[PDB]
Design a protein around this ligand. Structure first.
Ligand code: ZN
Lengths: 108, 166, 204, 149, 292
């Protein structure tokens, strides 16, 4: 079955310009205090998350080199230490990861 | 092809006389070649019409459509030249006066099918037109109240003239 | 083909207090040892070049050049000024309307120093009151006052190609003395951006 | 028609869902923080919490050893669960896993993204939301009410 | 007639504005560097005594304008609309600052000033009402208080529940009208003339002039209404979202004149409250508030 006649632009225009078919505005936009960038109320910041995710790779890269092989996951707890920080007695008996950078302000 | 939108940015007004209000700035920006459907892009243009520069940019940042990202890029370029070349003091003091999309030159190809059939393949391109006016978006319209409607109806009745009479 | 050379052969040093100041004219006579031999070189090709009478001819070109800006007489302005001078004068005035007028000169113009295959460069001293008002594309005023006179003292360098038979005196550059007052501020406001940093980087 | 359903349909079948969940659990244990689709992350959150309980039960438990071996493909992790994860969570009675919403992927599919991590880990703290301080005007007004009461 | 006082009061306010404007010739560029936590280090060249903090917010983004209620110029609280004076360091204060105590007081003062405006115009021109002062009470008190002295003719008149509702309607109309808060720093001598009729206002002006070495006093004007302020006030009346006149308490030792302290509560648009919460706050705001 094919259309019996051409559909008029006016009829077509009304269909596409009906409110149901139009793009709706969003009121859930929020600001990120940490980075000062926009975010949604139910969505986290990304500018700061970029630092966190990349820092994780840098920390993970250090971990990968230290292990040196697959299936080498330690059976003991692990800790990350940055330059200017010295291991404590409580840190004994735990895998220690050394980071050349200083302790990040956000990281505690 | 016609590029009159750019020429609108080249218009130079006569020097303003002392007894004249400060002329509001008008900026026309467009992207002539976009690998996007004008019809789909129009949906984005229609919603953003009349909104502020910041509000439109905020919505675009959280939009899922590819065209929305293009619109934000177009908006940013227009804003940059406005301050750089149109002597705009406050970046925030901008609103979307006009937003529309137009058809662009396309490419034609044949669409092959596995069972010996063929189809008409087209690479769609479109143009996008926006005019930005310095200042906040105009206040929204207030719907007429019942009292206003009744007053006009009475006024209309009085305005009536007798038809086909001496 | 070049009819002018960028820069000044010998940079004349203005003395502070010259605006207050015969007198200075004698200083040129004292300094003719440095400049008179140069004056002879211009005289050799011309023989009518005199420091006393040159400023009047130079002044007309300087005033006329500014007048062309009001009418955007680019063709006329090219003849008045050298190729070096033109780009500075008109490039920043694009899509702008300027009202410029010349008030009576505060002091008479006098040649200051000259130092020229031969491009005679003559330094002239000019103090004049002028009015300036520049507007936007939309006509909005952006700089200067329409009818307020501003007294400006500057030294103007003209350059003529001596070798060429068609060589003529055209404005080449302006020497600004350090003691000259700063230019008037713009009406609009500018913003100095803060340092730009990557997400990894932090403000300092 | 998803009324009363308590299980998500993932992978190519129920076995694939277990294997896909098994792979996700093994990866999470190794790294302690993994980013995945919200729907899948929610489904696997319950499994991770129960795994910590199995570690708490004790190494000598035969069922835990069988459970740990099956769920963790990489056998180096089996000592870790009993000697790293289980000791860490001994004080905790639950809520071992923290799941939060991440901005959707800009990969043309706009999948809902979430991050699931084990609490008490040595990884850098996630950017958690901070509640409003009591110094706010509304809270201070409520503080005055509290003092009166 | 009270209207006559407003007319002359408005003129002196207008003439003072012109004198200050004339005092400053030409536009002087002042380098103000942004010390705020967000976007730090930006330097704007602004016109001295003309440019206001709100102009800088406009320069950056619309978010700054909406979320900036006050500005810290060289570590000093400045009104968002107060023209800048010199090169300085500027930071923007918002309602959600970690320590909004300074912000709360400015909102507290502005609400008290707005309440004073309602009282004078609430009554008919026949009645005579003189405002004594705006007592400063902590936010913990649960209500902002404004003291006013009535005439002997009103000694037996107490507002009813409907009358209290009418006052909120007048206050709500002011919020809807959205009148920006004008700010003038004026010497005591001129201020005394502007408020010569109200003896109570005379003493308050003297106190402020006494504290500072000079006689300059902080005067704020909401449209026709003018009053003295203990500190910075809200830029506009539209900030408030919920407004209520909780109750009025008459001071017992009020023989020469009937001094009434009016209790009210207000909330900004940035901080809306639930209906149940607002009802409880209004109930808690109907109790007499003493100064401690
Ligand atoms: Zn952030």
């Amino acid at each position: 079955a094919a259309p019996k006649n051409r559909r008029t632009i006016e009829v077509n225009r009304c269909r596409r310009r009906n409110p149901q078919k139009l793009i709706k505005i969003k009121n859930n936009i929020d600001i990120c205090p940490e980075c000062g960038h926009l975010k949604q109320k139910h969505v986290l910041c990304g500018y700061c998350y970029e630092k966190v995710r990349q820092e994780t790779t840098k920390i993970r890269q250090q971990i990968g080199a230290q292990e040196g092989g697959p299936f080498r996951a330690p059976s003991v707890e692990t800790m990350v230490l940055y330059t200017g920080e010295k291991p404590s007695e409580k840190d004994q008996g735990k895998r220690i990861v050394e980071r050349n950078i200083k302790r990040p302000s956000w990281f505690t | 092809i016609s590029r009159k939108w750019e020429k609108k940015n080249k218009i130079v007004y006569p020097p303003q006389l002392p007894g004249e209000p400060r002329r509001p700035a008008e900026i026309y920006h467009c992207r002539r070649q976009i690998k996007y459907s004008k019809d789909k892009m129009w949906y984005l243009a229609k919603m953003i019409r009349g909104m502020s520069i910041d509000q439109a940019l905020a919505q675009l940042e959280f939009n899922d459509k590819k065209g929305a990202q293009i619109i934000k890029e177009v908006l940013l370029e227009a804003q940059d030249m406005a301050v750089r070349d149109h002597n705009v003091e406050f970046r925030s003091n901008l609103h979307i006066a006009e937003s529309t999309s137009g058809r662009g030159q396309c490419l034609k190809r044949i669409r092959y099918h596995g069972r010996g059939r063929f189809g008409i393949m087209e690479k769609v391109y479109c143009h996008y037109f926006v005019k930005l006016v310095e200042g906040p978006p105009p206040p929204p319209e207030v719907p007429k109240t019942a009292v206003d409607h009744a007053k006009d109806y009475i006024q209309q009745l009085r305005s009536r003239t007798i038809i086909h009479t001496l | 083909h070049l009819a002018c050379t960028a820069g000044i052969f010998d940079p004349y040093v203005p003395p502070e207090g010259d605006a207050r100041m015969l007198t200075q004219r004698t200083e040129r006579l004292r300094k003719n040892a440095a400049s008179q031999l140069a004056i002879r070189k211009i005289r050799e090709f011309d023989a009518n070049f005199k420091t006393k009478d040159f400023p009047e001819k130079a002044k007309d070109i300087f005033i006329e050049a500014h007048l062309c800006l009001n009418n955007s007489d680019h063709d006329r302005l090219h003849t008045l000024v050298t190729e070096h001078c033109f780009p500075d004068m008109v490039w920043d005035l694009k899509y702008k309307t300027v009202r410029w007028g010349f008030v009576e000169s505060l002091e008479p113009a006098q040649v200051v120093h000259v130092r020229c295959n031969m491009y005679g460069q003559v330094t002239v001293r000019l103090h004049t009151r002028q009015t300036l008002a520049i507007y936007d594309r939309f006509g909005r005023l952006m700089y200067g006052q329409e009818d307020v006179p501003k007294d400006v003292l500057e030294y103007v360098v003209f350059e003529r190609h001596l070798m060429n038979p068609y060589g003529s005196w055209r404005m080449h550059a302006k020497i600004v003395p350090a003691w000259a007052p700063p230019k008037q501020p713009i009406l609009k406001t500018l913003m100095i951006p803060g340092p730009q940093l990557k997400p990894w980087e932090e403000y300092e | 028609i998803s009324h009363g359903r308590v299980y998500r349909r993932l992978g190519l079948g129920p076995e694939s869902r277990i294997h896909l969940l098994r792979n996700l659990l093994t990866g999470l244990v190794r790294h302690e923080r993994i980013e995945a689709t919200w729907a899948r992350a929610d489904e696997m959150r319950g499994y991770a919490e129960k795994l910590i309980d199995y570690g708490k039960l004790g190494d000598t438990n035969e069922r835990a050893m069988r459970m740990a071996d099956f769920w963790l493909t990489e056998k180096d992790l089996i000592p870790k669960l009993f000697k790293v994860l289980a000791p860490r969570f001994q004080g905790q009675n639950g809520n071992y896993t923290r799941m939060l919403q991440i901005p959707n992927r800009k990969e043309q599919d706009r999948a809902k993204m979430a991050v699931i991590e084990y609490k008490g880990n040595y990884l850098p703290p996630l950017p958690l939301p901070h509640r409003d301080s009591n110094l706010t005007l509304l809270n201070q007004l409520l503080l005055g009410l509290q003092q009166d009461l | 007639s009270p209207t006559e006082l407003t007319e002359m009061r408005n003129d002196l306010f207008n003439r003072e504005k012109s004198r200050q404007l004339s005092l400053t010739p030409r536009t002087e560029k002042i380098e103000v560097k942004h010390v705020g936590k967000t976007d730090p280090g930006t330097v704007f060249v602004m016109n001295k005594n003309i440019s206001t903090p709100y102009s800088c917010a406009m320069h950056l983004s619309e978010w700054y304008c909406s979320k900036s209620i006050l500005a810290l110029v060289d570590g000093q609280p400045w009104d968002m609309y107060k023209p800048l004076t010199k090169s300085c360091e500027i930071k923007f204060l918002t309602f959600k600052d970690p320590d909004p105590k300074e912000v709360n007081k400015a909102y507290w003062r502005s609400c008290a000033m707005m309440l004073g405006c309602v009282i004078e115009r609430a009554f008919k021109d026949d009645y005579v009402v003189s405002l004594v002062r705006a007592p400063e009470v902590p936010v913990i008190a649960g209500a902002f208080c404004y003291d006013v002295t009535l005439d002997k003719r009103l000694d037996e008149w107490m507002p009813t529940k409907e009358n209290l509702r009418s006052f909120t309607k007048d206050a709500h109309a002011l919020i809807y009208r959205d009148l920006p808060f004008e700010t003038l720093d004026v010497d005591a001598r001129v201020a005394l003339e502007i408020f010569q009729h109200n003896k109570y206002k005379v003493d308050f002006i003297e106190e402020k002039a006494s504290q500072n070495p000079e006689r300059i006093v902080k005067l704020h004007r909401i449209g026709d209404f003018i009053d003295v302020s203990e500190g910075p006030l809200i830029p506009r009346t539209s900030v408030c979202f919920q407004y209520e006149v909780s109750a009025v308490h008459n001071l017992n030792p009020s023989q020469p004149n009937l001094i009434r302290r009016f209790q009210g509560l207000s909330l900004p648009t940035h901080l809306r409250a639930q209906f149940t919460i607002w009802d409880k706050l209004v109930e808690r705001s109907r109790k007499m508030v003493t100064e401690d």
